[PDB]
Design a protein around this ligand. Structure first.
Ligand SMILES: *[C@H](O)[C@H](CC(C)C)NC(=O)[C@H](CC(C)C)NC(=O)[C@H](CC(C)C)NC(=O)OCc1ccccc1
Ligand SMILES: *[C@H](O)[C@H](CC(C)C)NC(=O)[C@H](CC(C)C)NC(=O)[C@H](CC(C)C)NC(=O)OCc1ccccc1
Ligand SMILES: [Cl-]
Ligand SMILES: [Cl-]
Ligand SMILES: [Cl-]
Ligand code: NA
Ligand code: NA
Lengths: 305, 305
């Protein structure tokens, strides 16, 4: 038993990380098959970043302006192109460690693992959620750009996130691997703000099922609620609305524990209106919303890859 | 910026995990060079586990009673031996993925990454601390035994933990890679209890420095304290004593932030006596003690491997 914020094993991704240097700027790239993906702002100076014209900047660059280094090996760039906010550098050697992979755009609330890298080398791995305001609360320092987020499905790596910037609040923004930002953000150093973040209600309920599975039951109550009445309370505490689709996705956890989804909603309702009274749930004094229903099933049934 | 519970990249360890089957019992082994390490209770039946005589049980086993499977490859066992609570199976093939490694016994308070595995395959990776009562609060299901804990130092994997059992409280116990349990526990299914757990004071202070580095400063106060006076308060809240060695280890964080260690102790003192008043520190309503001082420096300076 036990319940931890668990990341995916990172070896399949570690074997894809490289270092991309253009001019004096160095960040990470993702080497799949014969293409290296990296944030396009690698082609900027420290001065360009206020409002760069990336089209113009890339036109002035030749293949040999991009230094791509896999470990100590030197990769030869034989082509370069821009797709939205990411650079695609064609190299002369396919990565022999290329896993089976897919590029996917995740939805707010879904979780993934981040392999935080500097200079093409891994620093650490951690799990996090795409917030409802399309930011993530990561741990990223200068040079971490080009670090990727991912999920694993049996043997297939689903890449969903490439890191590009930090907004003043310590919050992090990036793109999918097709180069489109999550949220309204742009890769230039002009003033930008994330907008209203809310709590991922379906994930909190998932985590309450996780607590029951692991023996924390004090919050189960005799009350029940309707879906609309629950959302009346949720909205007041800046929780995302719970939809019928969310109810369906919580179905299997409800079946495993024998606690109807609306009965668990009624328990959450009381927690929101009364607090925890200095009690804890899975060691936490706050309601946790970075576990999806599938994250709970995976970890509590021991799914492997 | 940002601060997350970060695990080490797990690829070097993933390449060492195998599946060991004896009779009907299957757990994980660690394949380094030409030796596979696994928990010795793999040689028990479901009935033996009450009070096995492992010496006797192993004597009745032949090399071919141990089925060792690396992926789909079948390893040949050519030798078997017992060191304390772990089995050492000699195989006919060195692991080609063997990293540079060391076996180390960590001390209470120190952190490591756990690569949770089933049937020799990774399920996930998470960071945790050796509690003062020599247990860990992990996430382990049946079949997870033989999963290992580890740290990385540049290129060297320091293996410190092999998982063996769960005590009734959902708490987890295991050995170092020489087979000796952390704590007073024994690998048989007789009644056992962990004993008094306490909060890892030096780690909480580390995490308060981490909060300052990341911009949370509301808890810094004008007060100061002596080391003995702080420990008078700490003991009352079941915090481990802070020693002069702990002060020295916090030195570099104190120098980076400009906050003397005893001034941070004074801030912790007020937090303990007054609570947080519904405030949070790095998103947490409770004081976090699973980060060592070096974990904070690593993550906040971007150390790589
Ligand atoms: C890439 O490694 C690096 C990672 C960060 C964690 C530092 N990203 C950048 O340097 C990035 C490059 C630009 C061209 C996309 N810039 C930022 O992320 C920048 C961070 C600095 C200012 C600390 N943030 C930024 O410009 O945010 C928009 C903004 C600007 C001005 C006022 C408010 C908000
Ligand atoms: C190995 O994969 C598995 C992992 C656990 C997470 C289930 N470990 C065991 O099966 C282990 C084998 C014994 C011989 C060391 N047994 C236990 O960990 C056992 C767990 C069961 C009872 C759920 N725990 C145990 O025996 O604890 C001691 C005990 C016994 C009786 C009363 C209180 C405490
Ligand atoms: Cl309804
Ligand atoms: Cl908390
Ligand atoms: Cl003193
Ligand atoms: Na209603
Ligand atoms: Na004193």
């Amino acid at each position: 038993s036990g319940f931890r914020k668990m990341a995916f094993p990172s070896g399949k991704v570690e074997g894809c990380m490289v270092q991309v240097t253009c001019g004096t700027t160095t960040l990470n790239g993702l080497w799949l098959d014969d293409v290296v993906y990296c944030p396009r702002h690698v082609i900027c100076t420290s001065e360009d970043m206020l409002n760069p014209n990336y089209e113009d900047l890339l036109i002035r660059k030749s293949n040999h302006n991009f230094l791509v280094q896999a470990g100590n090996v030197q990769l030869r760039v034989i082509g370069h192109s821009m797709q939205n906010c990411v650079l695609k550098l064609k190299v002369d050697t396919a990565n022999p460690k290329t896993p089976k992979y897919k590029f996917v755009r995740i939805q707010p609330g879904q979780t993934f693992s981040v392999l935080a890298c500097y200079n093409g080398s891994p620093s650490g791995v951690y799990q996090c959620a795409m917030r409802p305001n399309f930011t993530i609360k990561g741990s990223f320092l200068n040079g971490s750009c080009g670090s990727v987020g991912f999920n694993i499905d049996y043997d297939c790596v689903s890449f969903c996130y490439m890191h590009h910037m930090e907004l003043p609040t310590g919050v992090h923004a990036g793109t999918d691997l097709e180069g489109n930002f999550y949220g309204p953000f742009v890769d230039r150093q002009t003033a930008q703000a994330a907008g209203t973040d809310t709590t991922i209600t379906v994930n909190v309920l998932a985590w309450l099922y996780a607590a029951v599975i692991n023996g924390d039951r004090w919050f189960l109550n005799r009350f029940t609620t309707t879906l609309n009445d629950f959302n009346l309370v949720a909205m007041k505490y800046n929780y995302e609305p719970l939809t019928q689709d969310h109810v369906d996705i919580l179905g299997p956890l409800s079946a495993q524990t024998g606690i109807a989804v609306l009965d668990m909603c009624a328990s959450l309702k009381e927690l929101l209106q009364n607090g925890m009274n200095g009690r804890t749930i899975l060691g936490s004094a706050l309601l946790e919303d970075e576990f999806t229903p599938f994250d709970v099933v995976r970890q509590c049934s021991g799914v492997t890859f």
